[PDB]
Structures are given as C-alpha cells and as structure tokens.
Amino acid sequence: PLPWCPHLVAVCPIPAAGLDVTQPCGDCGTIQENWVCLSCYQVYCGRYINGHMLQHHGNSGHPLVLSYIDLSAWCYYCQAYVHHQALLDVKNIAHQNKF
Template sequence: MINAAVTCEQIKDGDAVNPQMSLPNMLYCVVPLDWCPHLERLQPMPPEGLNPQTPCETCGDPRENWVCLHCYQVHCGRYVNQHMIQHGLECHHQLTLSYSDLSVWCYECEEYIHNEVLLPFKRDAHWKKFGEMMLGTE
C-alpha cells in the first residue's frame, strides 16, 4: 500500500514512491530549480512594472500569456499558439514568467526556476493581477 500523504520534499529527496508508478488520484508536484545560469541575464523591470492583462503581442489572444524577463514582450504559451516558445528560440531569451500561475520557466534549462531574484517580478504581477500582496514573500 502506498502512503497518500507523500510530500513534495519526499519526492524531491527521492524518498517517495516509484515515479514511474501511475495511480488514480495520485498527486504530483513540480520542484523548481533554485538556480539557473540564465538568471544573470535578467533585465531590470520596466519602470511601469508588469501588466498581467496584456494580450499576446503576436496574435492578440488574452489567455495563458507569458512575459519575457529579458525584453518584456508578452506572448501566448504552448497551449494557445506557442508564440512565447517561438520568441524564446528566435531571440535566445530563456526566462519567462507565466501570467497564469506566476511560475518562471527557462527554455534552455527546460525547468521551472524559483529564486529570490525573481520575487520582485512575481510580487508585481501578483499585485496587479489580484490587487493584494503575495503571501509568504514579505
């Protein structure tokens, strides 16, 4: 019998169930990297900050958009028209922030990233999206 109360830390530390196992109602977690060499290429946030309501600059779609943390262009994600993927590949801009869930993805590392240097971007987007401070980052 598998313990259903497996934590993300157990998964991260390799103490959890076999990752190849697929069970109904089993939860999975994503453990972001805490460092990525592309964090060093971040550009300062624009003076006006971020705007989570910005539609894709290529197709105008308002859903599932990401902001490039190198040039601050906004494009739609892989489940819409993949314009941010195209932007990242063409411009070699690796880091992008999701306006859907405020996660940061690195196209070159192919991993989610969470680092203290990303908190100002996440806080700004959270404030403008929800009208309140982001919990746990004061």
C-alpha cells in the same frame, strides 16, 4: 522548482510602466495563457495556445519567462521551473497587478 539556473543573469529590471498581467499576446492578441519575457518584457502566448513565446525564445534566445496565470518561471534552456531571489521582485509586482 530549481533554486538556481545559469540563465538568471539574463533577468532584467522591471519595465517603466510596471507589469500588466492582462496584456495580450504581442503576435496574435490572445488574452489566454500569456507569458512575459524576463529579459525584454514582451508578452506572448503559451505553447497550448499559438506558441508565440516559444517562437520568441527561438528568435531571441531569451531564456526565462513568467506565467500571467500562476506566476511560475520557466527556463527554456534548462527545461525546468526556476525560483530564486532574482525573480522575487517581478513575481511580487505581477502578483500585485493580478490580485
């Protein structure tokens, strides 16, 4: 992945309740292939399901999303995976909740 991107500044502190990697898509309620937004912590499905996180990106401009499948982080603007110290806490919390 990229070791940095200019959108890491938009990564916000982890939600009150923590992360729930089994949380369904906030639009369609699918359990499959969800991502969490690293700005606002809404959960929406991936492009191969119904594309709700890509719709969220378009209507919010929020850049960075974390996969509840493989804990990869995608930047929609840089069109790349990103891994950096600023993402360790959210990835560690998601990993603890999943495994």
